[PDB]
């Protein structure tokens, strides 16, 4: 193990003089991928179930703490609302479906990789789909039966583990493929229509045409494009199976990182059901079976009170978790009104 | 043996050494037991599973309801049966008619499938993204408008909120 | 007139709901005997009524913490919405905006202020074109052994005749040399047209 | 079930989460070893020598049914306290390491 | 060089208050009959 100073990066010196400049002479087409998250798991939780279970001395003591219950199940659809409200604003900028039509004529330009693939059961794209596979979830669907952990699966597989104290996990308004046919539409207005669809009706252009335009718009003149559009089209087919080889070899942290911590707060929740929080056990069984009601209520009142602290602590922190998806997809928003639907 | 509870039992395959008598999980709850008579590990699972949710089109409009079983796939441990089951990727919709029309979300069942209350009944749908379009697109085609409209829209903002004091020994 | 603000309506109801689920929270017994300090006070005496009253006064005193700890989750969201209506009014009324859709759908012209309960709404004035047609169009024309393209524009055909007009306003005119400028010949470009 | 937990007689349109799914339990089991012999409670607690205190005695009890009724009517204790279980759930239980 | 960084003094302010609030909350009860935990452990016997 070695210790360092950490280096800022290379040191450079640019050759500054009073009548001297420097005018680039070629270019390059370059493809970057930006990830950014939009939603997290929408839970729900059961007080009774959670704190109780089918104890019934329990729920008539816990009488007296419903409107905590009430209050916290109401922060949490707050919260669940909230998700499928950012992935609309996110993806469902524009209602016209566009298709692209079976003219692949784009000057010369490969859109293959990114358009959707009708041999698949989804429409994804090919880049969609090495995406879907580097992000590993938790609930693969959302129906659990009863009778499919009905033994000692339960307490071993996490889920039911979950579910059986009264944590449900609920699924996403728009599915995988809804979500697909709307980038299919951002992705076909914007290569036959370049950004007018953006303002108004889509109004057809040539793909070499509107990246002339956008040429224009960063300072050079049509010419240039013209002049070097077979250069241009490589370079851009380059990049973009650049990207895909990357991605297929070796990752998406920042996505795999919400449902991890997810997955940790419900799984913590669960460990804590093993706190005494000052009885005698934690156990409801154990005190109510040797102990009589008037002396066993001290006990499962100090239960009630741990294992309501704990409703409010979860709770609490996915407010703040919540408040951070929202900014970050309120920026993914913007990115999708200035970067895809126009020229920034 | 003295220890109470509620739940199902049924047959186990661990196997205890011989001074045990209850097994525990991980959130501490007795979850294996031996028989004390036959000798047997038996598991209990609890009885208490799946989540329900009522969808309603105001009680200032009608009592009809509809059910969902977010645990459940009929193709049971459901309340009721009735009429108009409708199995879903949320769970089995109880009370509402499947149609293969599709509208605008009214209110939203989840996994793409709304309801609302039309043609009266409550109807469950799948939801629909947005009306179809075409581009014609041509290698040398190109679409210039020739006349405008001028647009005059609104949007709304929250800016403060309502300031508070408590006094605590008054409260 | 006719029929709203929705978004202003909620705060207001969010914050009297907090209030009223505090007064609320006042008949929770919190594991006590009874919920009334009268009821502990007369009844009971100081030592072993003291029980009782920390017992109220610790349920008490996580209701206040939980209505301040909800309280700043929620002033931080209306600070950012706060902020985003102080760029939009600096962005789309003291200016014009290029930013795609931050001022209204469209093309962005103005904007007016006006204030209401707890916030504020804008009037964003865009232009949105209307009743397209179709042309025929060409990258660049040839002349005499050379291309020329459009200075601020872009070449159309009725048809039969050729002509320049600008990107987003069909103004048809004639192809000049003063429209036009050239570079190379008409050997490179790829849909070049003779005209 | 959402009428009460709204605290309102009014429902307005929208879906609303309630309870799990309940089911109630049908019957009621005991299931306890096979004791077919009485405590000796008439050798402990009718014995004809006790033990000095500085060398009390300790006896080991095992294998026999606890029911202390039939010391109503030959017994009469002065003091009776327990510690970590209530003496009305005595008849219930099963004790280890007696 | 005359005279300021108010917005960014606030910020160690706020973080040194806070420190020193959780310090001076070592001094309540709780309701229990001292906040010493050594004034409990000696006169009061283990359970
Ligand atoms: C532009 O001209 C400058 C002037 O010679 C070149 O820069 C110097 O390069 C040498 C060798 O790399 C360095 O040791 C000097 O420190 C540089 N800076 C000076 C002398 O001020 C530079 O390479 C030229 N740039 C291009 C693109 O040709
Ligand atoms: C501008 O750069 C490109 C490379 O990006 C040059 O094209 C390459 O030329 C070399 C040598 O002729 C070939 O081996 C490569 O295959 C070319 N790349 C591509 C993508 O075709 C180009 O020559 C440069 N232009 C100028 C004027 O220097
Ligand atoms: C551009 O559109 C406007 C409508 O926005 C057209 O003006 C309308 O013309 C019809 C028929 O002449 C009248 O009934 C309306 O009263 C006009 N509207 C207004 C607001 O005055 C206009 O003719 C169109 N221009 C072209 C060249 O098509
Ligand atoms: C394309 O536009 C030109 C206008 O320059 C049309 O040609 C003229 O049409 C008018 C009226 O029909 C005549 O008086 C002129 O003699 C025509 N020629 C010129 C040079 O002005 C032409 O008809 C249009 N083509 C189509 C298909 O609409
Ligand atoms: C407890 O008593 C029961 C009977 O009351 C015993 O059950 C017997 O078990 C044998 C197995 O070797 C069977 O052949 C008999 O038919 C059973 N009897 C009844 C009535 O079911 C049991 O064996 C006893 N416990 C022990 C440890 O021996
Ligand atoms: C302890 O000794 C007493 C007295 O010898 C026994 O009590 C008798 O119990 C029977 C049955 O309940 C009664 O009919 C007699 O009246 C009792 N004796 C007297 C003097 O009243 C008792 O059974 C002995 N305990 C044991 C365990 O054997
Ligand atoms: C390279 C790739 O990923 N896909 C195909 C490839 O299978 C096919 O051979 C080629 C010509 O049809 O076009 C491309
Ligand atoms: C009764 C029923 O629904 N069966 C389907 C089966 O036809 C289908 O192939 C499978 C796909 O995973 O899902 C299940
Ligand atoms: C031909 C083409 O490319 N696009 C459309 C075509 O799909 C449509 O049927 C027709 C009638 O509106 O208008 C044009
Ligand atoms: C008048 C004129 O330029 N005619 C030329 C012709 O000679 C040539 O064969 C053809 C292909 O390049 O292009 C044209
Ligand atoms: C586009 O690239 C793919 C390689 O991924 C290739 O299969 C396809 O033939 C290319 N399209 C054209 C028109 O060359
Ligand atoms: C619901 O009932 C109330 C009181 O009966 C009434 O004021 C209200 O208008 C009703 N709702 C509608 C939509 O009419
Ligand atoms: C219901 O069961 C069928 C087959 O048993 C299965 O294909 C389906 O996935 C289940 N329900 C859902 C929506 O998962
Ligand atoms: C509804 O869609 C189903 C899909 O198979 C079809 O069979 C049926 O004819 C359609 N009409 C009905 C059943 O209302
Ligand atoms: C453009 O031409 C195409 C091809 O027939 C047609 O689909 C479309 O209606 C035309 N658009 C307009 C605005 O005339
Ligand atoms: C456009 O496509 C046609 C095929 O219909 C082809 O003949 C022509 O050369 C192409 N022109 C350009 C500029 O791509
Ligand atoms: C354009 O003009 C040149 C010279 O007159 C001629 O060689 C060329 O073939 C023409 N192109 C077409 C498409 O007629």
Not at chain 3, 169 to 189: A, H, K, L
Request: hydrophobic residues 40%.
């Amino acid at each position: 193990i070695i210790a360092y100073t950490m280096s800022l990066g290379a040191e450079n010196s640019v050759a500054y003089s009073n009548n001297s400049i420097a005018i680039p002479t070629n270019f390059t087409i370059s493809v970057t991928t930006e990830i950014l998250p939009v939603s997290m798991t929408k839970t729900s939780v059961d007080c009774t179930m959670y704190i109780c279970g089918d104890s019934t001395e329990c729920s008539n003591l816990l009488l007296q703490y419903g409107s905590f219950c009430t209050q916290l199940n109401r922060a949490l659809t707050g919260i669940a609302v909230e998700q499928d409200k950012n992935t609309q604003e996110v993806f469902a900028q524009v209602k016209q479906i566009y298709k692209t039509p079976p003219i692949k004529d784009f000057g010369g330009f490969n859109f293959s990789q990114i358009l959707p693939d009708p041999s698949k059961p989804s429409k994804r794209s090919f880049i969609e789909d090495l995406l879907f596979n580097k992000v590993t979830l938790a609930d693969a669907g959302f129906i659990k039966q009863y009778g499919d952990c009905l033994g000692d699966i339960a307490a071993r597989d996490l889920i039911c583990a979950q579910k059986f104290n009264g944590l449900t996990v609920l699924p996403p308004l728009l599915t995988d493929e809804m979500i697909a046919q709307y980038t299919s539409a951002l992705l076909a207005g914007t290569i036959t229509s370049g950004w007018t669809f953006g303002a108004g009706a889509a109004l057809q252009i040539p793909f070499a045409m509107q990246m002339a335009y956008r040429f224009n718009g960063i300072g050079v003149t049509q010419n240039v494009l013209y002049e070097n559009q077979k250069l241009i089209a490589n370079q851009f087919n380059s990049a973009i199976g650049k990207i895909q080889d990357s991605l297929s070899s070796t990752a998406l942290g920042k996505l795999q990182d919400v449902v991890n911590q997810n997955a940790q707060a419900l799984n913590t929740l669960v460990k804590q059901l093993s706190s005494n929080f000052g009885a005698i056990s934690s156990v409801l069984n154990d005190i109510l079976s040797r102990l009589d009601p008037p002396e066993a209520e001290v006990q499962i009142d100090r239960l009630i009170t741990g294992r309501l602290q704990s409703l409010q602590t979860y709770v609490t922190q996915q407010l703040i978790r919540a408040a951070e998806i929202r900014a970050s997809a309120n920026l993914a928003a913007t990115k999708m009104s200035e970067c895809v639907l126009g020229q920034s | 043996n003295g220890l109470t509870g509620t739940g199902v039992l049924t047959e186990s395959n661990k196997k205890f050494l011989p001074f045990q008598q209850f097994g525990r999980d991980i959130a501490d709850t007795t979850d294996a037991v031996r028989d004390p008579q036959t000798l047997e590990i038996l598991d209990i699972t609890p009885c208490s599973f799946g989540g329900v949710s009522v969808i309603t089109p105001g009680t200032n409009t009608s009592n009809q309801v509809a059910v969902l079983y977010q645990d459940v796939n009929c193709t049971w441990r459901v309340y009721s049966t009735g009429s108009n089951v409708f199995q879903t990727r949320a769970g089995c919709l109880i009370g509402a008619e499947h149609v293969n029309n599709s509208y605008e979300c009214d209110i939203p069942i989840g996994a793409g499938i709304c309801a609302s209350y039309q043609t009266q009944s409550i109807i469950a749908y799948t939801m629909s993204l947005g009306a179809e379009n075409s581009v014609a697109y041509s290698n040398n085609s190109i679409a210039i408008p020739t006349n405008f409209t001028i647009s005059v829209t609104t949007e709304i903002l929250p800016v403060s909120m309502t300031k508070t004091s408590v006094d605590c020994t008054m409260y | 007139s006719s029929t709203a603000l929705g978004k202003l309506q909620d705060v207001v109801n969010q914050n009297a709901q907090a209030l009223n689920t505090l007064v609320k929270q006042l008949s929770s017994n919190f594991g006590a005997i009874s919920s009334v300090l009268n009821d502990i006070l007369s009844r009971l005496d100081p030592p072993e009524a003291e029980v009782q009253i920390d017992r109220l006064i610790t349920g008490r005193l996580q209701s206040l913490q939980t209505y301040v700890t909800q309280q700043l989750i929620r002033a931080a969201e209306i600070r950012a919405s706060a902020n985003l209506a102080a760029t939009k009014m600096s962005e789309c009324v003291l200016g014009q905006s290029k930013r795609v859709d931050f001022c209204g759908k469209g093309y962005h012209l103005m904007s007016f202020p006006q204030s209401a309960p707890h916030g504020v709404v804008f009037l964003h004035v865009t232009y949105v074109p209307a009743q397209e047609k179709n042309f025929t169009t060409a990258p660049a024309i040839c002349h005499d052994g050379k291309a020329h393209f459009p200075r601020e524009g872009v070449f159309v055909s009725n048809g039969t005749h050729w002509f320049v007009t600008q990107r987003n306003f069909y103004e048809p005119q004639i192809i000049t040399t003063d429209n036009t400028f050239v570079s190379g010949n008409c050997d490179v470009v790829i849909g070049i047209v003779n005209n | 079930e959402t009428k009460c937990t709204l605290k309102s007689f009014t429902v307005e349109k929208g879906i609303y989460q309630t309870s799990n799914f309940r089911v109630q339990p049908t019957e009621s089991i005991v299931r306890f070893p096979n004791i077919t012999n009485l405590c000796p409670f008439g050798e402990v607690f009718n014995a004809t020598r006790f033990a000095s205190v500085y060398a009390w005695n300790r006896k080991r009890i095992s294998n026999c049914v606890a029911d202390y009724s039939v010391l109503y009517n030959s017994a009469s204790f002065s003091t009776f306290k327990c510690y970590g279980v209530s003496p009305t759930k005595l008849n219930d239980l099963c004790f280890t390491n007696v």
